[PDB]
Each structure stands twice: as C-alpha cells, then as structure tokens.
A paper describes a structure:
The red/far-red light receptor phytochrome B (phyB) plays essential roles in regulating various plant development processes. PhyB exists in two distinct photoreversible forms: the inactive Pr form and the active Pfr form. phyB-Pfr binds phytochrome-interacting factors (PIFs) to transduce red light signals. PhyB covalently binds the linear tetrapyrrole PΦB as a chromophore. In these structures, two parallel phyB-Pfr molecules interact with one PIF6 molecule.
In the phyB-Pfr‒PIF6β complex, two phyB molecules interact with one PIF6β molecule. The PSM (containing the nPAS, GAF, and PHY domains) of each phyB protomer is clearly modeled on the basis of the density map. However, the PAS1, PAS2, and HKRD domains could not be modeled because of the absence of their EM densities. The N-terminus of PIF6β (with only R11‒S60 visible, hereafter referred to as PIF6N) is clearly traced in the EM density map, suggesting that the other regions of PIF6β are disordered. The two PSMs from each of the two phyB protomers have a nearly parallel orientation, and they are arranged in a “head-to-head” manner, which is quite different from the “head-to-tail” arrangement observed within phyB-Pr. Helix 1 and helix 6 (also known as the helical spine) within the GAF domain of protomer A, along with their counterparts in protomer B, form a four-helix bundle to be involved in the dimerization of PIF6β-bound phyB-Pfr. In the structure of phyB-Pr, the NTE is flexible and invisible, whereas in PIF6β-bound phyB-Pfr, the NTE of protomer A interacts with the conserved β sheets of PIF6β and folds into three helices around the PΦB binding pocket. The hairpin loop (HP, also known as the tongue) in the PHY domain folds into an α-helix and is located near the PΦB-binding pockets. The A-ring of PΦB covalently links to the conserved cysteine residue C357 in the phyB-Pfr GAF domain, and PΦB adopts an “E” configuration, indicating that phyB is in the Pfr state. In photoactivated PIF6β-bound phyB-Pfr, the D-ring of PΦB is in an “E” configuration; the side chain of Y303 changes its direction; and Y276 moves away from PΦB.
Numbering used by the authors:
A (entry chain B): 11 to 33, 41 to 60
B (entry chain C): 111 to 144, 156 to 379, 393 to 565, 577 to 621
C (entry chain A): 54 to 143, 156 to 379, 393 to 565, 576 to 621
Amino acid sequence: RLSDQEYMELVFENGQILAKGQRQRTKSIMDLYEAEYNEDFMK
Amino acid sequence: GGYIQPFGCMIAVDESSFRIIGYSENAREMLGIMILAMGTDVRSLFTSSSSILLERAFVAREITLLNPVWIHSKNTGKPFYAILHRIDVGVVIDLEPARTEDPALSIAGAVQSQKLAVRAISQLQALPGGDIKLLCDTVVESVRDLTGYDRVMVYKFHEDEHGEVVAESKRDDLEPYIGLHYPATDIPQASRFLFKQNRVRMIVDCNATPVLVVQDDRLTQSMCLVGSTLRAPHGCHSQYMANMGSIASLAMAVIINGSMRLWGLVVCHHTSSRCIPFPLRYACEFLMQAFGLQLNMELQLALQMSEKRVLRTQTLLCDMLLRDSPAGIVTQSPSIMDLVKCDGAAFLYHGKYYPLGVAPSEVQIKDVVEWLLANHADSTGLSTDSLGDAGYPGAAALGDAVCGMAVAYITKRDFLFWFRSHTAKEIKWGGQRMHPRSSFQAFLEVVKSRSQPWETAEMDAIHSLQLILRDSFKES
Amino acid sequence: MSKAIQQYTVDARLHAVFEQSGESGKSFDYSQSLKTTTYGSSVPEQQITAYLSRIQRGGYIQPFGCMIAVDESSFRIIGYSENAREMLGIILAMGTDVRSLFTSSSSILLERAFVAREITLLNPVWIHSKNTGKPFYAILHRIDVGVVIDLEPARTEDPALSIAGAVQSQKLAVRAISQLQALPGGDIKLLCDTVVESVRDLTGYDRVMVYKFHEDEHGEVVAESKRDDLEPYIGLHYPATDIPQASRFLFKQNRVRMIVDCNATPVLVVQDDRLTQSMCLVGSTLRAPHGCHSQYMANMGSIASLAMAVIINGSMRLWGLVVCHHTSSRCIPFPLRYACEFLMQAFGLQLNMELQLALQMSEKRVLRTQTLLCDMLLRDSPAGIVTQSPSIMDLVKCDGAAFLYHGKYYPLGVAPSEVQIKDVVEWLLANHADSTGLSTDSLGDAGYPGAAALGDAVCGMAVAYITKRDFLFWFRSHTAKEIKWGGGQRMHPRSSFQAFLEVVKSRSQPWETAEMDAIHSLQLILRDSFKES
Ligand SMILES: *[C@@H](C)[C@H]1/C(=C/c2[nH]c(/C=C3N=C(/C=C4/NC(=O)C(C=C)=C4C)C(C)=C\3CCC(=O)O)c(CCC(=O)O)c2C)NC(=O)[C@@H]1C
Ligand SMILES: *[C@H](C)[C@H]1/C(=C/c2[nH]c(/C=C3N=C(/C=C4/NC(=O)C(C=C)=C4C)C(C)=C\3CCC(=O)O)c(CCC(=O)O)c2C)NC(=O)[C@@H]1C
C-alpha cells in the first residue's frame, strides 16, 4: 500500500554503516480523503 | 448540440469576446443562476479573480498547461474546477463542482495530487524491471488504492486490436474478468482515438439522464463536443455497462512509443455511481503517465532479450548442422521448436518426415506440400494464421489442432514447418444481450479456427534460419 | 571494503580537517587535504560517529523557513528554531501546545495530520499563523522523538492563485515528461540534454547541470544549460570526496534538496534539555548545508542550489544528480519542488531503460565480434584476428591491443614496443603465473617495474593467457587523455578538476565487468581452438 516516506539515519555500529530507520492502514486513499477533508469542523 | 453527463456543466464561449455561444441545460442550476443566455459575457458569471484566471487561460498559447482553473460562481460563491479546451469556434469550459470549499483544503488537495503521484511512481520504481505482468499488477493495486473502485483492470490491445484483461484487482464478491478476451469491435476506433487524445475518460453514472448542450443557432456546424471531459457515453456503451453491472467508470489510456501508440487501458468500474475528487484523478493520471513510460521500457527490453534468445537458438542449430546431418536439428533438445513460439514443428528432408509436438500426419503433410506447390510454387516462405482462410482443402481434416502454419523453403523437396493451434486453446475463462460473456463468446467465434498471428520478429527468425539451412544444404 | 564504504573514513577525516581549519582561523587547504587524506588507514569509530551525527544532527536550519518539533501525542513543543518566533509573528517555548500557534482550522488540520497511521492526505498542510495570519506550508515528518513540522512561508495571494501555481508547475513537469517520452531512444546524452533544458525551463535557475557518478564514485558533468555569460562546466570531472557518501545518502533520502542562500546565517534549533541527543534533521527540508559546502558554493560563485537525485533500480542506486545553481538567492514554492521530483522520477525510469538497453546492445555487439573472430581464426591463420578489420581491438573499448604468438608480436593502435612487451610478459610470468589473465587500471600501481617508461600512452592492461607463451593484451591510456574541460587551495571547481586529474594521474578507465567477461569468453574460445592445433 501507499505510505509516507520513512527517513533513515546512518549509524556506525559493529564497524558497519547502517541506515537505521527512525521509529496499519486498511482503508483506501479515497476513504482517507473523505475522512480527513471533511469540512464539518468549519461549520 | 451533443449531450453531457449531469455531474457537471459545460459553457462554450467566443475566445475573442468571451460571449457565450453555447451551454448545457443544467448550467443555470449548477451555477445557481436559476443571467445565463446566448451572448452573455461569461466573465460576469464568476467573481473578478475567476474572470482574471479565465482571461489568463484564454490568452495562453498552450491552454492545457492550466486545465483545472479554480473559479467561483458570482451568485452562490461555490467553487468549480473549470477545464478549458479549444474547439474550432471558441473555448469550451467544463465546470465540475468542487466538493472541498475550504481554500486551505483545496490547496492541500492540489499539492496532494502531486504527493500521491510521486509516492505511487516511487512504488513503481522499486520493481526489478523485467516483468510486464508484475508492472501491471502493481499499477492495478495502486490505482485501486487511489480511487477505491470496486474493479480495476488492465486491458492490453493485441495486434488484432482485440483486448485482453491482463491484470485485475476487484472486490472479493465480484466475478473475475482476468484472462478474458473480447472482440476489437467492443471499443470503436473512434473511442480509441479519443482515449489517445483525452487520456482519462470518467463516467459518473451510466443510468443518469444526459444533459443537452444548446448551442447558438448562428453556428454553422454542431459544436465539437469531443475533447470535453463531460461528454456523455453513447447508448450502446451505457447499456453495456448497465448489463455488466457497472455504473461508474474511470478509463485511463496507456500510451507507449509507436507517433504514440495506445497499448491499452486501465479501467476502473464501480457497482454504484462514483465521482472521485480532482486530486485523486490527477494522481492517477500522473501514475498512468509513469506506467506508460516504464511499460515502453519493458517492451523494448523484451524485444532485445527475444532477439538474443533467437540468436542463441540459431547458433545451437548451426552447431547441430555442423555436427551431423541436417535432420539432427530435429533430434536434440534445442530444436527448431525453440526458434519461435509454436505448438509444433516439422522437417521434411529428402522425403523423410520428422514431426515434433503437434504436427499433421505423413499423409496430411504430403497433402499440405502438394497444396503449397500447386498454389505457392514461386515463394521462398510464407505464414498463414488460419489454414482455412488461406484455402487449404485439408484444413478441416487437421481440425483445431493445426490452424496456423509457417513454411520455410529450403529446396524443391525439403521444407521447415512451424504449426500453431487455434487461439482458444490457450484462453481460459469462466463464462444477444451486450454482456461480458457474450463478448467472450463472440471473440471465440472470431478466432474459432485461427491461431495467433505470426509476429514480424518470429518470421525474421524463420527466414534467418532458412538462409542458414539453405547455405548448409548447398554446401552438403 | 568496497569504494563507497571506504569513502566514509575519508569523508570523516576531511570533515575533521575542515573543522580544525575553521577553529584555528586558518583557511581550508583543499588540495593538500585531499593529498594527505587518502583511502585506507584507520579511523576510530568515535570520529566516524561524530561526523555522522554532525552531518545528520547538526542542529542548524536555513533561515528561509522555521522548524517546530512536537510530541506526537501531547502536541507539546520539544524543539523549535530560533527564528520561529519571528517567522510566526509572535508564546513559544518548551512544552507549549503547538495548536495554540495557528488558527483553529489550522490546528484541526494539524490534529488530523498527526493522527494518521501510515499515510496522511494533509502533508503539507496550508496553515495560518494565529497572531498574523501568515500562510505556511507545514511539511510533517516523523523522527524518533516526535513529529517535525517544517513551516515554509507561502506567498500571500488569492487561494485560486496558489492552486494555479501548483497546477502550472505540475503541467510543466508533465509536458517535460511527454517530451522525454517522444525521443528517438538509445541515446543517453540526448536524454540528459532534454532533461536539463526542461528542468531549466521549469525552475528558472541560472545554471542547470547533470552529474553522473562513475564506478569510482567520482562525478562528471554530462549535461548543462547555463546562462550565456556564465562559465561552462560541461565535461568537468571532480573527485568522489567532493560529495561525501553521507550527503549522497541524504540526497537519496531527500529527493529534492533546496538551498536558498549559502551566505545566510544558519538558525540554531533550540531543543528540550530532556532529549538524549541532538534532534535529527535528516528528513527536514530546512537542514542547513555544512560550512564546507557553503564555502564551496561561495567560492564557486553560486548562492542558491537545487539538487534532485537521479535514482535508478540497482535497493535503489543514485546514478547521479540534477543540480540547479543560481547566482543569487532563490527559493521556489513547494509545489514546484514536487513537480521537479515527478520529472526526476520520469527521468530516472527512462534512464534505467536506456542503461539496460545499452547493456543489451553491448552484449550483442560483443557476440558479433566474437563470432567474426572465431570465423576468421577457423578459416585463416591466427594473425587473422589482428590483421583484419574486426580485430581483437574492436572487442572492448581500448586505446590499443596486441597478440603475442610464438614470439611474433602483432600490435594494434597504441601498444608497448617489442622490448617493452617482452618485459611485461616477463613480469607477468614472474609475478602472475598462477592466474589466467588480469585487468589493471594502472601498471604503476600494479607494481610493474617500468610502467613509467611506458608513460601515459599505456596505463591499463587486460592481458589474457592463451598459453604459457601466447598472450592477448588490451591497452588503455590515462583517463586525462579523454577528458577535456576549458579550465588549488581554494574550494573552487578548477581546484576540484586539478585534484581529480591528480587522482587519475597514471590510471586508465576501469575495465568494466562486461568487458572482462567478453575478454574471458574470447580467451576460452581461442584456447579451445589452439589446444587442438
Ligand atoms: C456498441 C455499438 C459497441 C460498443 C461501443 C463502445 N465501447 C466503448 C468503450 C469500451 N467498451 C468496452 C467494453 C468491454 N468489453 C468487454 O468485454 C469488457 C469487459 C471487461 C469491457 C469493459 C471497454 C473496455 C471500453 C472502455 C472502458 C469503459 O469505459 O468502460 C465505447 C466508448 C464509450 C465511452 O467511453 O464514451 C463505445 C461507444 N460497446 C460494445 O460492447 C458494442 C460492441
Ligand atoms: C568538504 C571539505 C567538501 C564538500 C562537502 C559537501 N559537498 C556536498 C555536495 C556537493 N558538492 C558538490 C561538488 C562539487 N564539486 C564540483 O567540482 C562541483 C561542480 C562544479 C560541485 C558543485 C556537488 C555537486 C554537490 C551536490 C549538491 C550541490 O551540487 O549543491 C555536500 C552536501 C550538500 C548539501 O549539504 O546540500 C557536502 C557537505 N564539498 C567539497 O567540495 C569539499 C571537498
């Protein structure tokens, strides 16, 4: 599924340069759009 | 004039004077006017900023560079997305109401179209790059996630111009259509041309009553309501969609290098009326552009690898020719059957018959040779998609096992044959009224006794092997 | 330990040298630092860890926007840039509720953005400052300790005009992609030129150019569209150390990185004292460039910059960059940056296409040459593979070739003299009699006693063993022969070119794995043919 980009940081561990990551969706992007872009809060 | 879908509005105006020369019947209700009439200045129907944006779009050389103009009705203030395009007379404006009225949310959605397109294309990038089926499946999943339609499928248009459902992602309770084939006549060539021009075709509700477009009586010809995004589907396709059980549709053209070529479509179907907001439509459009690019890549790579494989097969056949007598090419694993895609092959050498796989009997092949000599004596080789169409008397005797047949001439008595069975052999699918099942049956009727067409590359390989074997025979 | 992974130690050492030069009030000696700081040696894990932290956790941002890092759950501010108070028109302090800094609707949209699980459709968010109403693009990303909000000021205008700007940028990118699609194909140079022109038209920067990263990891300017009065830079090669590997990783992370003004003073990011370490700015679009690159850009004469990564499939690979330089400060709107990213993704897809097609064509050409060579050897004397038009010199890219057969020397193009080739054969037998061939970038580094005599004409070799005395040689000249650019303490492009020429002073181009595979296939065929004679 589509997801926001997760950003990684380079760390020097065990003599290796590791791109250690920093830090579930079931509804479609359209359902997320309807949920997030609801204007009822502006009324 | 023509008819448009009731989910939007259409106003066609004179480019030089901005005077309205035509409009849809629902324009007044859509804009809250119910004034709007022939000759009315269109800029007076929208706010001042909307008029400025419309003028800027009008004077632009490439109007498509700003298609979605966010304008506001002067009366109600509701936002609309105006898609502007040029016709022979003036400029046509397709006004689709914007569900999101908050300006901040509108800007956020405008940027989210780009963000979602970028993320989907990034998903596409991660693919290894050597599998068209994987690419199609990934695109289908991405498009279903973005739009949320009940069905999303990829249609591939074959050289015959008939379509195949090469990928699909559907609701669990719907009939699958993957692997289906339908006749080329199901998509008229005019519709294919329009898909080439207007890459995205959206039908909100097939059963909705279309809206007439009243145009000025002073216009000589009917308004060119062709590139309009609100154009209503024809009765034939509307009834076809109703029978299929699909109410909403979102077709997107897949364009590759041919002058561009329409490789196929990515069509989304919904069991109920559906009209997704503009940000998602444009995210899908950008994803489709990237998909077309990568698909052209995959096709070119496939051609290169096919050439490489054919060259290796020819080299192995040359090695076999050098190692033993010519018949040895039809005795080892890398035989002529690997040169081209076929269901069988055969070698006639000094009156000796060497069949492989699905091939006719000795008497049948002798009859075929006699027919070839009678009708095609002056030929260095030929390819027939269907022996019945060519006119072979014994085709009915061969049946569906042998329908397509390619002959390479070595000499007056030695021949190479590549036999291919009828198409319905490698087409499997579950399934008068215009229905998917009827389309599949009609297609099977079209190719009843016809094999797959012999590709240009396949015939080039056959001719190359023919030249090599002719030189070897002359040496021997 | 590879080449890129070995470059991390060199990057750390050069970073330390630059920091010491800054601390002591001296001037960074670029050429001497590169000469002294060579690959290999040993560097303690402390130095590399500190270098990585300073690059990724520097604690400074660009003053063209502000940054606010908040707790994910409580919305309490755990960090903020020192210019946030002025940028927002402002109370702002540790523990302040970030929702109190923006209007009610903006706070609601921020709340909606935060509560997202995996993907959110409010990122960026068009928000307004509570006190002044100033519009901002709030770009949200997640770090180990919370959520970082990059507030980039947006032009005040009619919302329809903002939507129009985004639409125009995206449609320009789409038109550029359509132009890229309708190309003859099989020509990477044309692709790069078209992309450079399209990107310059889209962004409007004074200079735009494409960098290709070679297997050595050094870079080459393969395309450019500049202002007429500006100095050309096409054909320029620079050392790999000029773009550190950490920076290349961050460019893979940040697909479009913008530097508005190199001479602007970085803004410190005040941080909660309860956090274990400095805040991570890897994903932040406001992360300030280090003084090293800021000084490099100032010396170059470029103030603004916009670097877009070219990512190809290889678990992705950074084939290079498309960098736009400006002679004055230039900040572009975020929608234009996303349009640029979309165009760059299309460029990456088509470039991967071209690279794989070129690989296939090279394989086909090599096969044809091998087949012709076998045909000539079978139906002619062995010298037939060197005295005829499709000789062994045409098998692989080389400046010369040679065949030693039973004491007979058959050279082609640029090859060592007869005595020199005898000396080379003696060296190979003395030191490399346990192998069946070797590829060398430079005979000097390989330990050949006399590579200096050969000079720059013959630097590389791809000797292939046919027998104990019969040999096939492929020779190349030093890279500087094929490198031409119309142009070293200061960090300036001319200094970089001179340093690069120093690195490859006595080395030829690397022997590509495909070329060595072709050489070995031809070797096997010829050994089979000869052993039966
Ligand atoms: C009537 C005289 C013929 C006709 C016309 C027609 N077709 C289209 C476009 C499509 N027709 C599709 C139908 C098929 N065929 C199948 O077996 C099948 C199963 C999956 C489908 C979906 C098809 C793929 C399209 C485009 C997708 C879509 O929009 O749904 C049009 C264009 C109408 C328009 O889009 O404006 C016309 C006029 N259709 C028939 O079936 C008759 C032979
Ligand atoms: C520290 C002593 C070194 C340093 C660090 C550094 N470089 C980059 C990124 C770039 N520097 C580029 C290199 C060159 N060198 C040239 O010869 C040349 C072209 C004429 C340039 C501009 C380069 C192309 C980049 C990529 C980004 C860009 O072009 O702006 C970075 C990261 C950049 C950032 O922070 O955004 C760092 C830290 N630069 C040196 O040259 C020193 C050896």
